[PDB]
Amino acid sequence: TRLFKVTALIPSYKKVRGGRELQNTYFTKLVEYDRWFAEQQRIQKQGGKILSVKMVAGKPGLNTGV
Amino acid sequence: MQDAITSVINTYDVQGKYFDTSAFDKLKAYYATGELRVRAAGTISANAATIIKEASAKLFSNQPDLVRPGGNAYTTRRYAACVRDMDYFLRYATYAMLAGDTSILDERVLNGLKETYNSLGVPISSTVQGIQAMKEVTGSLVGSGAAKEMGVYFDYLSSGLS
Amino acid sequence: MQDAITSVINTYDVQGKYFDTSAFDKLKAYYATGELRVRAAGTISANAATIIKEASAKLFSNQPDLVRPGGNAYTTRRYAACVRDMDYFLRYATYAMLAGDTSILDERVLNGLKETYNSLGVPISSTVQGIQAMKEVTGSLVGSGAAKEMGVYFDYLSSGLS
Amino acid sequence: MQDAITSVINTYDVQGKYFDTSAFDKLKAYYATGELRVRAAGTISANAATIIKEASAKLFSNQPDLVRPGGNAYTTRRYAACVRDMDYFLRYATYAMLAGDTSILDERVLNGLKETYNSLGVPISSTVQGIQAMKEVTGSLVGSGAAKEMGVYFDYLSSGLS
Amino acid sequence: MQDAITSVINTYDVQGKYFDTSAFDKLKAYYATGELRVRAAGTISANAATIIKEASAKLFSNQPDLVRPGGNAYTTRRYAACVRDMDYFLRYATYAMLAGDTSILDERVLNGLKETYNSLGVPISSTVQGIQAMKEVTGSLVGSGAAKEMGVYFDYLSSGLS
Amino acid sequence: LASRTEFDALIRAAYRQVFERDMDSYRITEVFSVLETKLRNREITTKEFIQALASSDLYRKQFFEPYPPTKNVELSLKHLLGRATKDQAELRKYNQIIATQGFKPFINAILDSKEYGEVFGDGTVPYNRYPTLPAANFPNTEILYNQLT
Amino acid sequence: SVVTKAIVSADAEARYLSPGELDRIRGFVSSGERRLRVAQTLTESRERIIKQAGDQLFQKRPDLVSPGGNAYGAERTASCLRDLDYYLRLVTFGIVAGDVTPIEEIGVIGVKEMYRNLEVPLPGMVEAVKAMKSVATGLLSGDDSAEVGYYFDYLAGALA
Amino acid sequence: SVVTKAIVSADAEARYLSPGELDRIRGFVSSGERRLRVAQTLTESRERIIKQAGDQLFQKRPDLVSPGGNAYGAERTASCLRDLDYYLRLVTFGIVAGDVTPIEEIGVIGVKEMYRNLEVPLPGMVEAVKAMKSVATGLLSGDDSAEVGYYFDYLAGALA
Amino acid sequence: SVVTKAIVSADAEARYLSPGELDRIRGFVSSGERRLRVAQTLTESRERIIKQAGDQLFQKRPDLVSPGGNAYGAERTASCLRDLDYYLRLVTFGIVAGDVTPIEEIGVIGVKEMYRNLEVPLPGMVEAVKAMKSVATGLLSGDDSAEVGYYFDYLAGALA
Amino acid sequence: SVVTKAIVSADAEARYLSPGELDRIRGFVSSGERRLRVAQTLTESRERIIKQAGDQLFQKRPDLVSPGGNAYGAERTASCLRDLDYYLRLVTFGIVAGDVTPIEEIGVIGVKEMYRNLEVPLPGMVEAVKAMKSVATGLLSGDDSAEVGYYFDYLAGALA
Numbered sequence A: 001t002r003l004f005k006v007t008a009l010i011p012s013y014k015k016v017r018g019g020r021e022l023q024n025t026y027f028t029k030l031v032e033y034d035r036w037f038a039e040q041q042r043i044q045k046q047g048g049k050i051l052s053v054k055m056v057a058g059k060p061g062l063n064t065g066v
Numbered sequence B, C, D, E: 001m002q003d004a005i006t007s008v009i010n011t012y013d014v015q016g017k018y019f020d021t022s023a024f025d026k027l028k029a030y031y032a033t034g035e036l037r038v039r040a041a042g043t044i045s046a047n048a049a050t051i052i053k054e055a056s057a058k059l060f061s062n063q064p065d066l067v068r069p070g071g072n073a074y075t076t077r078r079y080a081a082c083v084r085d086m087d088y089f090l091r092y093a094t095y096a097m098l099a100g101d102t103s104i105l106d107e108r109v110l111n112g113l114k115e116t117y118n119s120l121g122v123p124i125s126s127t128v129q130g131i132q133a134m135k136e137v138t139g140s141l142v143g144s145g146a147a148k149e150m151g152v153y154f155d156y157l158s159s160g161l162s
Numbered sequence F: 001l002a003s004r005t006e007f008d009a010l011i012r013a014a015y016r017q018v019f020e021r022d023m024d025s026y027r028i029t030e031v032f033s034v035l036e037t038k039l040r041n042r043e044i045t046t047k048e049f050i051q052a053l054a055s056s057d058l059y060r061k062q063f064f065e066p067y068p069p070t071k072n073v074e075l076s077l078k079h080l081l082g083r084a085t086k087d088q089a090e091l092r093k094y095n096q097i098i099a100t101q102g103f104k105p106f107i108n109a110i111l112d113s114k115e116y117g118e119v120f121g122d123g124t125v126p127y128n129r130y131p132t133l134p135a136a137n138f139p140n141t142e143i144l145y146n147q148l149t
Numbered sequence G, H, I, J: 001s002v003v004t005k006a007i008v009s010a011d012a013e014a015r016y017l018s019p020g021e022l023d024r025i026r027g028f029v030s031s032g033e034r035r036l037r038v039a040q041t042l043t044e045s046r047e048r049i050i051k052q053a054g055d056q057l058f059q060k061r062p063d064l065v066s067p068g069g070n071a072y073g074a075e076r077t078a079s080c081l082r083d084l085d086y087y088l089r090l091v092t093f094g095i096v097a098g099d100v101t102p103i104e105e106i107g108v109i110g111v112k113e114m115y116r117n118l119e120v121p122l123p124g125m126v127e128a129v130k131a132m133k134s135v136a137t138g139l140l141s142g143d144d145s146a147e148v149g150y151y152f153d154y155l156a157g158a159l160a
Ligand SMILES: CCC1=C(C)/C(=C/C2=NC(=C\c3[nH]c(/C=C4\NC(=O)[C@H](C)[C@H]4CC)c(C)c3CCC(=O)O)/C(CCC(=O)O)=C2C)NC1=O
Pocket: A011, A012, A016, A017, A020, A021, A022, A023, A025
């Protein structure tokens, strides 16, 4: 397993930012497996929408080698 | 997220109208259920561990292949992930029951869960069965009205995962 | 990542079985080839810079247009990226040969490499030729059996890219 | 932090004792004063901006050099930091009065404040007179008993800074 | 960190000297005690939980005040913190024994530990007594041969605190 | 392909923030070559670059191995959150993580905290924050950041 | 609302609500009915509130509707009173919710930038909200006036 | 305490307490005398509650005092009852505090590691606190039994 | 295994394997036949070890097979011995791999919350694995029994 | 060293050393005697090694000792052979340590910056290290020659 590829939008509700922020609104990122629960929890907390995540590196169902 | 009151506020704001009689009736209806919801939330908080205990026991009794070698729940790691997921489902359905609205389930549970499980190869039908099992287990502990209220959010979760 | 031993362990754990005769045979096969792999890996590490030197020299001699203006490797930056990519391929082919398994290759080199090179404009066939030059230099260096061993993983990289 | 209730609880926990008549008497005293405390906190919160208005006005009237060029409160930024610090002191004094205890003052205001200001060349004595200005303004708004109450925490901050 | 071998290496590197007979003698001494150190470390790894159990039990039996109300180890949080500190001490003393050098003790344990304990009000004498209890239990488990060596690092830690 | 110089400047600023100075003698560029390649190709964001530098063996030798866990907490908080250790609760939390899980879960606990997400998000390299709140954060942070390596 | 804030606070630590937090929600749902009556009273008398507040504002600040002012003109005065209507609706929303959260997340974030783009003077908005508070508290009883004026004071501070 | 929780939540947001939190404080301060009555009633039945709860626990889990159990013997049973007495005192502290905070910093943080080092089974702790719940709620009126069972349930869930 | 751990270590800092890493790989492959015949011996004798370890378990701690015990009844005892068979297979995998990495990945990561979900006491698991260690090292020669012992001690320490 | 690397890798995980790490340390300390014999052999013939390696290097690279070469003259040739002596001592340190750590901290970290500050061609250093590797491996038996050649190859790669 060991890697997810995450595409999520994170809208802004607290403030309208003076900087562009179109670094951080729509993005695709590679996140390692043990990271994803906390990461997805974070994007959910700031109100973002998870558009897709994919397996890239490993194979599902592996018992070791993860 | 948004609760029942905030849901009414949004549905009247997007149309730009003041609260009419129907909005006040909906708010009164939500306030009436508040004590029942708080009692049910307290009961589930007290017994969340046991609910997960016996719901996971029922799920792995009905599908023993899940926890045997070759199953998706076969390892201490993957069994731990399965029971963590069931615990999060119970706690978030409890949040939704308290709020009176399913927005928290969409924003913080179903937001990317379907296709995360698809990527991991998690069997969706067995997850639905586990959610149903937690539904009967919670209903037994919370009684009739609270069980109907929790069953609403449990069925919402089951539909979202399905 | 998986080596041969972890691959065997995963198979016999997904099947929930103890090691049978065939698994012990595979483990002996891996152990017997271990010293060959260690010597070949030490030889490659000793001559990694030379291997990349000569492999890039052969690549840019057979295809001189790559480093002339208009070629994908025409800049100090792009030439540096080319030789660094060749460094990556050699190091990970050494990792794969030492593990005895190709899971590290596709896991940490090949996922999206074709897509990335197509997005960048990197010519796939030229990179394949460079990998083949690395193959020839490394094979002429290490020795016949180690040459075949490294050739397996170099061919895996070449097949993955094309 | 710590309030009056938690103070009684901790005193009896360090002794390993169930509550006695004296503990119940102290708890009843705090519960008796809770309403006055809430009224003082509400009237302070409603008028906090005004209190800062007047306190800063009095401080910069008595000590003009603070806001003359080269003074520690001479820039828009440093003046803003000054009034922000005064609002900090007012808010935490309201917290302490509502709690009935000064532990929040030591924990979240005075800890490192003297050397914070000394590393910044902030006049500590001038800050103390700003605090007495806030004391005098607040006392006139909250009424005599709540004035004597708020004075305890204002003098606590003044003594900790001095 | 630094061990015996790296200590000899550093000593001779500062002098710019190849290894002479005395250096080889010290290296032989460490290589001779290596197997004893490894056996002791393996035993401590096997029985670390039991060591901490018995050491804490002995310390709290000799000083019952520590875990009764008013003691620095009276609460679940402070009891867990005490056990966590003793786990630190055991693991790092095991590291120092396996290294044959007390440098890791200075640079991961003792630096600032007295200031931390004095800031928190942690009794230094009772922590030293707990380290002696760990010393006795560990020496009993590791055997007479390694008990003397292990006591050196436990005594180093105790003298560093006291 | 474009804005290469700006992006390399960002990479070297990240090195200077995580390791407090330039680490060219430690050949930091070749150690993190694949990481830099991923960050150029926009496969990963700045936060994961910082996470890979702060969880590296080089970072562990520079700032985890030489120091006790309390100093480890305050150093990694300086490098990754821009401030000194905040209160006793934070010290307890990170001390427990260091005691039970070790160095890498400690780094990821710092980096996955809500505070990092609010202050630095996923795109900006951390920096000294000059925190005004809470009490004693400002002088402790100034003491830490007025110190050379 | 208060329930949402409590749920978010608990989800921050990934825990069920504490007994004290459930008691807080019980108090909220106990006060819900009186809040509903207060908001009913405010929403019934919205027309008179808007009329009186606009008249009081324009008499206190004649330059707004005088030539050269932003509010001069029939359509511009209509837009002004429409803004007052928006803010009254938001105040009712905040009253039923028990917190200023709906008020802020419809009409406080970016309000300075919007009114800067609209040439709308902020002190005029503050005075409009103050006159509107005076009228609303006049129509309400002594008990309701405190909490109703609370949200108006929050809105005025947001504009100021 | 309830006041402490309100102040801490307000401080996290760097604001004064809202009228909602002040109303919550007024409600708690109004319920203080009933809370003190409940705490006194539980405190006076200290020994009866501990004795009956120990009896029910040991009959429900005979293996705890059976050979090979953590509570085997007279002195380990006495330590068991001492632990129950600690938690009863903590429950009274929580009742007067109006929330489960003192229970948390005295008996819930690190209890897992503590009882692990003591090889005390946590489930047996859970049946012990449930037996305490039954006994203690038996001596109170239904209304007071509700809040007391709330704290006992928080304790049972925290240990479980 | 040894090879995977060395490779991931070298890939962490983007280098080839160091002479020490190659030395440890050579040491691992040289000892492969010995650890492999050890895996033989532990593999053909799975049933004897499982049943003897279960007997020793139930003798040392009788609460588990007693009323209120986790293994009370025939089916729970069968599952208990099934878990021992699982862990013996994991030990064989660890012996062949040269590390404990399969042991974490299959049966150590998450074992705490799994058994907590099963009402399974970790001290009982430690007793089980120590019984299995004694029985297994009985069947091996001194050098082989020692190296099997280290894996069993690691399993015991990780379990509790 | 090997032991130091195992200890730091264990401390990074806040754990005790694994069975594999303990086997690694046992293997390292068991082979310490032959490591010391190899280091003694290299130390005894260091002068011969340096002279022969200097001859080979200046034969393969005559430009270094030709005018304009970085090692032209008596003092620069002395400094060149002095650097070769430094690296031979570091290789002996690596032999006794069982890893290339002392080599790394004493003469690898910063080496490119240093020889750049010294107009010293890195290909010249690589050729000199290869020459010293051949001369040294000539004086040892095959089993020891491979191990010392691995340290020399690490040094050559670092200078490359
Ligand atoms: C620097 C280059 C750049 C641009 C220009 C850009 C556009 C942009 N505008 C946004 C917000 C928005 N922008 C608009 C404006 C649109 N809707 C109205 O109908 C108008 C017709 C129209 C504007 C002309 C609105 C209404 C939102 C709020 C959307 C929401 O979050 O609900 C957002 C979401 C992030 C945020 O809320 O700050 C982006 C990404 N993004 C970039 O990275």
